[PDB]
Design a protein around this nucleic acid. Structure first.
Ligand code: ZN
Ligand code: ZN
Ligand code: ZN
Lengths: 1191, 649
RNA sequence: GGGGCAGAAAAUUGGACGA
RNA sequence: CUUAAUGUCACGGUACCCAAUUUUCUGCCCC
């Protein structure tokens, strides 16, 4: 009786090269993949050996008959035979080394070649079957090869995979191995024949076919009866970009094109790409530029119009990859090749032992099926090697170096590009959780001749779980990561990469099957640990990048079922264990048998739960309030979506679980990597271990707590998301930054930079919520260190996000949640300078804004004060300041160019509003930072860090002396101003904040409460340096004379006489308004802090300048110090801050109260800042008027 | 010149500064890794435009990093294999497009040949000896002959003389070369001229040399390989070198460290096995009288004893022991009693399993008769049934009574000398010293291959001891530590005038650490791990083998009647180093004079009956309980022979 | 005298302690 | 053309581990 056998695989299976029994030993992969399907080279054909399905059927029959105590509808069965070479030899091609399930008695008769038992005849014992070649199809039972149901190409059926083996004591994986993951949708049906001459054992054969559930590493059913043109276009566009000397930013174009797959076709068809500035007449710096004449916004539209067939996802991905590769060819393409430690281990390795295992008669065995949903409470990662490496057939590439693809860290996607959760990763996570619950497991051994009998290994030998794919075939968001150099608190060179993370909230179906005698206590502990109860929160750390905080799955909709294998096995055969129909079990509430599990224990009933798994990870959820705007600088995402914003804030893309797909509203958050890095830097600076020479065998208080190159991290973080977003209505605030030239006093040639952060004010801060987990192996010192790090976060030293020096992400406090552990929760007048500068150049013709000369000499501190652990000698702390205005202050809010709403009277006239966030009037931090930085640089003759070179009216750059140029990297040396405020490759040691008024009168009353302004024309360096013979004028500064009364008087006489639509009118402060801002500092010496103090409040009758209209007299500010907090909180004595300012003057003098007027350049500086108000334009440019114009 | 040449010169300088023995091995690997960083970084920027000199430099660097990676026990490190493979591939790419001078060709072929030598030593299946022979011939015919200034040429010549070709024109340079060590000269004399005398004194010079070389140094593996070479073709020289290599291995495996120098450098089971073979076949020869042959069996006994357990003997201290347990799991870590001194009426049975010969051994010593004897047996079916019982007991604890019956029944069938009168005479107490497989076997319950064969404990008094150095040459109070539920195991044993010193109910771990040297009786639960983390279920978590070693300093000289379930058979089924890691072994190690430990799960009633046995503070108790009814009720045999006598009086 | 600037310079792969 | 039968636990193995999208900049100004 010939029976046609078919296959239907329901999860990605694996196949290997054919080779042969003589050739299997030569190739380690073939020996490893004996239990896999076989592939041939003719592109080629695929099939599975009849011997492999024969072994599967033999295992099925032995297990099935042990289930029923060796009795199967009347006929008894005997033990069989699995031992060879007892008389002559001819060992079978396959070796068992497995615990064969043997029986109590199995005593019917000594079976010979007359009355062979059903299991014996299925084994083909007493037939004419041989073991050499075959030579005839004369078998009593034959298992022919199973073939797929036009010379299909090799890659169309398989894609390579790299499975892994992660150690338990460490987090590092010691070794890996290749894999040829196939497809289970289209090329997953096989076809073959089986013959059975003996009718006495047909029932057993059919039952085995219905019972087998393990074939080629995948659940299966047994059934009875172009880019070539894109390459050229990428080359063309790259060449055209290079012809414009703008090749440096081709990769950000590749990243933008790759990100563009998230958006639909309308971003390119409806021209939704950003249009640049409204009236720039030049377009976006990247999008609206001309490639080979045509605009790129339209060139890409044409290229897509020629490429509808491939699809938007494929077109964008291929264009990005091609652009990246073409850029890499003319940066050489980066190639990766490890030296050692790349162990690809298979353990090929004759004890040929036989272990009979006899289960007691009458044992109650049941097979439990677990069905549920694996919701990702955090973004998930599943590591997969790069494309063009996962191509099968083109492997072994021996001492060959591979090519880096566009994505540094891919994520596991199937052929249809939906997120897939692999069997191997979930099995490994279950192994880790089971070993934790038991507390005693074995590090898995490979090629071991005898099965491990440890606790964790036994229960997984009876656990089978299926691969799952999420019903969300949408591109994964790309989470960039950067590495910070502790020496200079900046980016480590060559340390930027991308991470492909899936959206949080996806519903991955979860299938787990346990085939044992009793449902284990530890697996119940694991399931309850994974469950997302009311307060359990879910604890299935599943996937990779767990240290960052990616992969915390919260199992939910959990349903436990079970057949009774002893008495209801025929139903199991009939419904095939519902393999592949796992979805139907969720809605059903049901097939014959499969009664739901009613004895499933709760969380507070499992002893191993509380013993090992519950304390394993202790959550510490805490909220951070920041009274300042927060910005994370997602630049790549900023080069898309309307707004033309250079740096938008990072927004998580959350997916609504079970609801209508993805949520249109974004979720602003701080990256979990940022949280982990800030805590790690905190502990490193408080422990003195950051900046160490090496961490080879190190065991410091950072490698233990935050992991290292080899060990895993014992503390895992999460996203620092925002919860205070529903009561803002102005969550995103547009703030503009311009780099003022140190010579012209105006905008540089290319300096405008608009940042687009979140909201946040002292009267309405942002509530940022996040959590981190603690492993149950920390002593008192480590928990104390992490608590001190959290307190330092609370104290405000470490700002979240970017541009912390300006004031972004300045924390106002931390509120620990009441659910934190008890031990963790319990353990967590003004100085006015008396210096007076007469400024008596003319107490009783004029100049608009005199210049300042400081000399070309500069002292470069080559010994950089590293941003590592705090120096004991150096002083760190906080400075509180009181800000008052001697003249009205004007600071516009560019976010609303029509704040005054006066366009009705005259359209096209700019009318700003005074800067404010959430309605609280505030001075931007950049203003104070630039003010005091220019002041300190002129005080210490630091440099001209921002200089507008490349101008004639030759020697565009030679006009300035070749000693005071802006500073290059640290090799040359860093100025004291560059040592304090910082530069590129060296983060500044002083961070400024935001000024809140909360005092003084309200406004200035003269369109209401907002006096007009004259025309503020562009600064003209030609006037300062009329003749080329002159070398250069010095730093430019503005006087303090109150010319604002002229504007306040002739407001109507100038708002209509000239410039009807060219002027700008915005509201201003009044005289004597009191503000308050904080100026933090880390790792400053004595003289540095003294000079900073003298820069803040040099003394009486000296004031700085802020805001617009400095030549018009607007915006003069007076600063006073309340408290100089210092921690090594301690308040320094108010005795004029002795030994700090005095040491500053002492160190400055080379280059009782002191005498600043002695130094000439200091004298000129303070003359230019004198305020004479405490008590009581064409004829000049003529050649005969004044040749030598001085300062 | 170019950056290529400068970086190659730097790599050459680093490789030269790392190759010489003057550089400490502490800072030897780092130099090679740095040079190979430079080499591969140079290679990555130019895949095929790279000169052959850089390829041969990379091959040499891979060879150097391979030779500084040493075997980690029974498994060769995979970094070494990968380095050899990469070096051979790079040198093949070098010679495929060779564009250098004659000296460059000589160096390339020399490096390829020595890489092939080490790869054949490590993985013979891939680089078979025929292709190795062809490559060595191609190297020597190209000028790889200089033995005075190139030790690799000496290695090539030695491998050729192994392979079976003559070098009569090269021995003059081979013997006069200063770089050649004792082994090279021994190979030269044994193969070039087929001599045995000069080979013999150079061989003994090598034996003396091994006395100072650490167990990690490759000369040990070379010597063992040469002994196997001499064993392949019947020679009379490998006897003496086996004996002296054994002596040197004993004198050396007493100075190495247990923390990180003994698990994975005592890979010399083959050496001790074949020294045992040499002693046995020397004793197999006819002797004029029984005065030297009878004394060579004693030497066999020391062969057996010196390999069994040296880790346990030498066991703050807590940190070092935690390092030991970490190193057990293949992780990363950051006088002797004379064998003739045996009390009267006691016979000691030493044990050794020969992996080379495939047969077991047994050495007895009747103190009254002063006789040492040896007999042979197979150990394959015993391993079969031992694993069968262990698996069917781990899966089903009490249901493995039938497999206990089978294992104990076939132990006597395969080991009939236990019941032989001439081997172990009736009545005298028997002390067993097993070797890596028989420790877990319940030899006290061995059943003679008879129609109704009795046990071994029935007609002898059995005592176990992991090694021989454990045996070595107080208060009269008694203490009890109980942590069972207060519903059973109460009787009168809880209060029968035990002792007011430390007798407790619901005792804790700290209580066991405060005792005044009394015959401690302990009745709690144990689990057994897999490592040696077999906990004891005292209060406040429980006391572990780790804690027993670290803290228990009061039970010295005590007679422990520990009756906790799964104590003596804590160590797993498979062996690693022939070290026994039971809780009873820990108590014996800290200074106890004897422990009646339980192998597998026991019951409360049996522990109470053993505790009730206050006749003199066992075997007769086992006889009375019904240990002779293994064929009438396997369940009652399960719960009787679990208690075994561990220790020596 | 009927405004300019709207960013720029980078970093976008470095790895991965067994005696 | 597959396979070889009195022995295939490869569901026998988490692409795992490490590194803060950041450092620097006054929406500002005259021939
Ligand atoms: Zn049969
Ligand atoms: Zn195991
Ligand atoms: Zn500078």
């Amino acid at each position: 009786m010939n029976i046609t056998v078919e296959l239907t695989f329901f999860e990605p299976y694996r196949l290997v090269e054919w080779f042969d029994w003589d050739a299997r030993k030569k190739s380690h992969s073939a020996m490893r993949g004996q239990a896999f399907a076989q592939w041939t080279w003719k592109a080629g054909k695929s099939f599975i050996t009849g011997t492999l399905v024969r072994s599967a059927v033999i295992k099925a029959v032995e297990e099935l008959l042990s289930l029923n105590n060796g009795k199967w509808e009347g006929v008894p069965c005997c033990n069989g035979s699995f031992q060879t070479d007892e008389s002559k030899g001819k060992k079978p091609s396959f070796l068992r080394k497995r615990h064969t399930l043997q029986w109590q008695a199995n005593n019917k008769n000594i079976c010979d070649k007359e009355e062979a038992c059903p299991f014996c005849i299925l084994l083909g014992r007493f037939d004419n079957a041989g073991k050499v070649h075959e030579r005839n199809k004369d078998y009593d039972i034959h298992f022919s090869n199973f073939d797929l149901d036009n010379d299909l190409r090799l890659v169309d059926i398989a894609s390579g995979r790299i499975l892994n083996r992660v150690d338990f004591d460490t987090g590092k994986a010691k070794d890996y191995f290749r894999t040829w993951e196939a497809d289970y949708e289209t090329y997953g049906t096989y076809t073959g024949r089986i013959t059975l001459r003996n009718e006495h054992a047909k029932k057993l054969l059919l039952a085995s076919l219905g019972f087998v559930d393990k074939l080629c590493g995948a659940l299966c059913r047994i059934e009875v009866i172009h880019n070539d043109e894109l390459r050229k276009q990428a080359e063309v566009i790259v060449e055209a970009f290079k012809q414009n000397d703008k090749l440096e930013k081709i990769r950000i174009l590749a990243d933008a094109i790759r990100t563009l797959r998230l958006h639909g076709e309308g971003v390119i068809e409806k021209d939704e790409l950003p249009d640049g500035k409204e009236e720039r007449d030049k377009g976006h710096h990247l999008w609206d530029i001309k490639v080979q004449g045509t605009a790129l916004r339209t060139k890409l539209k044409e290229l897509w119009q020629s490429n509808k067939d491939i699809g938007w996802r494929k077109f964008t991905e291929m264009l990005g990859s091609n652009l990246y590769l073409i850029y890499k060819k003319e940066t050489g393409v980066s190639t990766r090749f490890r030296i050692l430690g790349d162990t690809e281990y298979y353990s090929k390795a004759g004890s040929d032992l036989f272990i009979p295992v006899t289960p007691p008669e009458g044992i109650e065995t049941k097979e439990w099926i677990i069905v549920g949903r694996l919701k990702a409470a955090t973004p998930f990662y599943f590591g997969v090697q790069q494309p063009s490496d996962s191509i099968p057939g083109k492997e072994k590439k021996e001492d060959s170096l591979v090519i880096n693809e566009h994505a540094s860290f891919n994520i596991l996607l199937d052929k249809e590009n939906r997120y897939r959760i692999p069997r191997s990763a979930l099995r490994g996570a279950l192994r880790r959780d089971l070993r934790t619950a038991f507390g005693s497991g074995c590090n898995v051994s490979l090629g071991g001749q005898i099965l491990c009998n440890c606790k964790v290994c036994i229960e997984m030998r009876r656990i089978t779980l299926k691969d799952s794919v999420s019903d969300f075939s949408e591109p994964p968001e790309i989470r960039y990561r950067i590495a910070k150099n502790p020496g200079t608190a900046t980016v480590e060179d060559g340390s930027l990469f991308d991470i492909e993370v899936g959206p949080e909230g996806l519903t991955f179906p979860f299938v787990l099957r346990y085939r044992g005698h009793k449902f284990p206590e530890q697996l119940s502990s694991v399931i309850r640990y994974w469950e997302e109860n009311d307060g359990k929160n879910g604890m299935a750390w599943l996937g990779g990048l767990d240290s960052t905080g990616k992969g915390r799955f919260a199992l939910k909709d959990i349903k436990i079922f079970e057949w009774d294998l002893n008495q209801k096995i025929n139903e199991y055969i009939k419904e095939r264990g519902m393999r592949g129909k796992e979805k139907e079990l969720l809605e059903m509430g049901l097939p014959d048998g499969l009664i739901p599990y009613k004895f499933f224990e709760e969380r507070e009933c499992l002893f191993p739960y509380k013993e090992n798994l519950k304390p394993q990870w202790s959550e510490v959820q805490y909220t951070i309030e920041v009274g300042s705007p927060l910005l994370t600088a997602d630049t790549i995402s900023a080069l898309t979506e309307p707004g033309n914003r250079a740096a938008i804030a990072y927004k998580k893309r959350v997916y609504n679980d079970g609801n209508n797909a993805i949520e249109p509203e974004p979720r602003f958050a701080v990256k979990s990597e940022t949280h982990r890095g800030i805590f790690r830097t905190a502990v490193g600076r408080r422990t003195g271990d950051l900046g160490k020479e090496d961490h080879e065998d190190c065991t410091c208080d950072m490698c233990i707590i935050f992991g290292n190159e080899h060990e895993s991290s014992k503390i895992r973080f999460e996203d620092l998301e925002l919860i205070n977003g529903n009561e803002f209505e102005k969550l995103e605030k547009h703030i503009d930054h311009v780099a003022i030239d140190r010579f012209t006093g105006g905008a540089l040639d290319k300096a405008k930079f608009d940042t687009y952060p979140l909201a946040g004010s002292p009267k309405k801060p942002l509530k940022l919520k996040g959590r981190f987990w603690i492993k149950k192996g920390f002593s008192g010192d480590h928990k104390l260190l992490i608590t001190t790090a959290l307190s330092d976060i609370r104290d405000g030293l470490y700002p979240l996000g970017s541009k912390g020096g300006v004031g972004y992400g300045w924390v106002a406090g931390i509120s620990i949640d009441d659910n934190v552990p008890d031990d963790f929760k319990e353990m967590i007048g003004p100085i006015n300078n008396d210096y007076v500068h007469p400024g008596h150049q003319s107490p009783k013709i004029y100049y608009p804004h005199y210049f300042l000369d400081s000399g070309s000499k500069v002292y470069r501190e080559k010994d950089i004060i590293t941003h590592e652990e705090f120096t004991e000698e150096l002083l760190s702390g906080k400075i509180n300041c009181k800000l008052e205005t001697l003249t009205p202050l004007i600071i516009p809010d560019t976010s609303d160019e029509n704040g005054l709403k006066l366009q009705g009277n005259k359209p096209g006239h700019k009318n700003y509003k005074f800067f404010n966030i959430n309605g609280e009037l505030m001075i931007p931090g950049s203003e104070l930072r630039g003010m005091l930085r220019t002041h300190f640089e002129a005080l210490t003759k630091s440099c001209f860090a921002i200089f507008g070179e490349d101008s004639t009216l030759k020697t565009l750059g030679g006009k300035l002396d070749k000693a005071l140029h802006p500073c290059t990297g640290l090799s040359d040396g860093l100025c004291p101003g560059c040592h304090l405020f910082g530069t590129t490759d060296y983060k500044g040691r002083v961070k400024f904040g935001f000024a809140k008024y909360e005092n003084g009168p309200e406004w200035l009353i003269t369109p209401e409460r907002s006096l007009t302004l004259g025309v503020l024309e562009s600064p003209r360096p030609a006037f300062s340096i009329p003749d080329d013979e002159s070398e250069i004028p010095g730093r430019k500064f503005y006087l303090h004379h109150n010319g604002w009364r002229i504007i306040r008087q002739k407001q109507l006489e100038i708002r209509e006489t000239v410039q009807p639509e060219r002027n700008v009118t915005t509201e201003v402060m009044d005289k004597g308004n009191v503000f308050s801002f904080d100026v933090r500092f880390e790792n400053l010496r004595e003289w540095e802090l003294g000079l900073l103090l003298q820069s803040l409040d040099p003394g009486k009758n000296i004031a700085h300048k802020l805001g617009k209209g400095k030549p018009y007299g607007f915006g003069s500010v007076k600063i006073k110090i309340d408290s100089l907090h210092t921690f090594k909180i301690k308040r320094v004595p108010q005795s004029d801050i002795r030994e700090y300012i005095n040491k500053g003057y002492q160190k400055l003098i080379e280059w009782v109260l002191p005498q600043w007027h002695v130094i000439p350049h200091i004298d000129k500086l303070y003359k230019l800042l004198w305020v004479p108000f405490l008590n009581d334009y064409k004829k000049l440019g003529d050649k005969d008027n004044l040749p030598y114009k001085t300062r | 010149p170019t950056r290529e040449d400068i970086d190659r010169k730097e790599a050459e300088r680093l490789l030269d500064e790392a190759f010489n023995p003057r550089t400490k091995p502490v800072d030897r690997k780092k130099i090679i890794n740095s040079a190979l960083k430079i080499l591969i970084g140079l290679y990555k920027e130019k895949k095929d435009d790279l000169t052959s000199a850089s390829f041969i430099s990379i091959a040499r660097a891979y060879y150097l990093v391979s030779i500084t990676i040493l075997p980690k026990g029974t498994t060769i490190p995979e970094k070494k294999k990968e380095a050899l493979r990469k070096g051979i591939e790079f040198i093949d790419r070098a010679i495929n497009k060779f564009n250098g001078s004659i000296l460059d060709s000589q160096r390339a072929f020399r490096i390829k040949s020595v890489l092939s030598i080490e790869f054949n030593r490590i993985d013979r299946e891939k680089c078979d000896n025929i292709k190795l022979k062809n490559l060595l011939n191609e190297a020597v015919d190209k000028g790889c002959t200089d033995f005075d200034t190139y030790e690799w040429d000496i290695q090539i010549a030695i491998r050729l003389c192994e392979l079976g070709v003559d070098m009569e024109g090269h021995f003059d340079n081979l013997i006069k070369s200063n770089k050649a060590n004792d082994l090279q000269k021994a190979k030269a004399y044994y193969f070039i001229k087929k001599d045995d005398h000069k080979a013999k004194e150079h061989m003994d010079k090598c034996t003396a040399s091994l006395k100072y070389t650490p167990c990690s140094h490759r000369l040990w593996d070379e010597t063992v390989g040469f002994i196997e070479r001499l064993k392949g073709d019947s020679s009379t020289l490998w006897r003496d070198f086996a004996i002296k290599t054994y002596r040197s291995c004993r004198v050396q495996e007493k100075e190495t460290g247990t923390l990180r120098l003994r698990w994975y450098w005592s890979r010399h089971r083959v050496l001790y096995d074949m020294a045992f073979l040499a002693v046995k076949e020397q004793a197999d020869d006819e002797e004029p009288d029984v005065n030297v042959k009878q004394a060579k069996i004693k030497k066999l006994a020391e062969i057996s004893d010196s390999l069994k357990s040296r880790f346990s003997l030498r066991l703050e201290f807590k940190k070092f022991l935690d390092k030991c347990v970490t190193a057990y799991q293949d992780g990363y870590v950051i006088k002797l009693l004379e064998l003739t001194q045996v009390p009267e009426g006691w016979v000691v049975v030493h044990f050794y399993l020969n992996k080379l010969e495939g047969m077991g051994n047994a050495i007895v010593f009747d103190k009254c008769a002063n006789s040492w004897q040896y007999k042979e047996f197979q150990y394959k079916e015993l391993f079969e049934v031992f694993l069968t019982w262990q698996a069917n007991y781990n899966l089903y604890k009490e249901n493995a009574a039938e497999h206990l019956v089978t294992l104990c029944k076939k132990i006597g069938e395969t080991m009939p000398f236990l019941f032989c009168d001439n081997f172990i005479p009736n009545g005298k107490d028997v002390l067993f010293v097993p070797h890596d497989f028989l420790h877990r076997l319940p030899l006290h319950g061995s059943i003679e291959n008879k129609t109704n064969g009795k046990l071994f404990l029935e007609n002898h008094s059995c005592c176990y001891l992991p090694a021989w150095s454990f045996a070595s040459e107080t208060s009269d109070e008694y203490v009890l530590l109980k942590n069972f539920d207060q519903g059973h195991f109460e009787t009168l044993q809880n209060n029968q005038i035990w002792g007011t010193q430390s007798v407790k109910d619901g005792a804790s771990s700290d209580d066991l650490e405060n005792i005044r040297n009394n015959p401690r009786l302990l009745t709690i639960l144990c689990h057994g791990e897999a490592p040696f983390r077999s906990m004891l279920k005292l209060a406040n978590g429980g006391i572990t083998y780790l804690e027993i070693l670290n803290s228990v300093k009061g039970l010295k000289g005590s007679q422990v009647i520990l009756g906790a379930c799964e104590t003596d058979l804590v160590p797993p089924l498979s062996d690693v180093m022939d070290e026994h890691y039971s809780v009873a072994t820990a108590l014996l190690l800290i200074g106890a004079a004897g422990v009646v430990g339980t192998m597998w799960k026991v019951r409360s009633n049996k522990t109470k009956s053993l505790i009730e046995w206050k006749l003199e503070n066992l075997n007769e108790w086992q006889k009375e309980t019904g240990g002779a009814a293994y064929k009438d009720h396997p369940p009652t045999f399960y719960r009787s022979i679990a208690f075994r006598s561990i220790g020596f009086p």
